[PDB]
Design a protein around this ligand. Structure first.
Ligand SMILES: COc1ccc(CC[C@@H](OC(=O)[C@@H]2CCCCN2C(=O)[C@H](C)c2ccc(Cl)s2)c2cccc(OCC(=O)O)c2)cc1OC
Length: 128
């Protein structure tokens, strides 16, 4: 499955190298440029618990997910992950709880100490 493929082949993109966030590029993007801290980014995503439950998709709303990178508007794993991405890229991330919702979780949807999986498509990004 896609999550197990990330376990096996994913690059560790954490600074501590604790395998907290693992990444595979599934479709290559355009150019060399990746977003800077403070850039406005536009993505589509599909997310689930590592074991398959709680599937959630922005495509639901025909509606890009928009946020400012590196401002702590999203879980740590997304600030780390999206910053590695090029415009047009689709990546898979597997995320240990320390980089997500931790021991608190977000009940009942996300349990204590949950590993998450996302497929993220970076549509565009623009400066502050
Ligand atoms: C800095 O740390 C945080 C910052 C924000 C949050 C809140 C959750 C955040 O969610 C997330 O950071 C991740 C990654 C972005 C897409 C949604 N996220 C999810 O986990 C979703 C809920 C999942 C989908 C399937 C899963 Cl299983 S988990 C989120 C959800 C919905 C909207 C939003 O911004 C704009 C608004 O308020 O309208 C932001 C949680 C944080 O830490 C635990």
């Amino acid at each position: 499955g896609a999550p197990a493929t990330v376990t096996e082949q994913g690059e560790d993109i954490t600074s501590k190298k604790d395998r907290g966030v693992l990444k595979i590029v599934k479709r290559v993007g355009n150019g060399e440029e990746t977003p800077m801290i403070g850039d406005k980014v536009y993505v589509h995503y599909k997310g689930k618990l590592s074991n398959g439950k709680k599937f959630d998709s922005s495509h639901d709303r025909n509606e890009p997910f928009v946020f400012s990178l590196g401002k702590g508007q999203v879980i740590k794993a997304w600030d780390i992950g999206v910053a590695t991405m090029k415009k047009g890229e689709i990546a898979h991330l597997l995320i240990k709880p320390e980089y997500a919702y931790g021991s608190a979780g977000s009940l009942p949807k996300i349990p204590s100490n949950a590993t998450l999986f996302f497929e993220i498509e970076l549509l565009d990004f623009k400066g502050e």
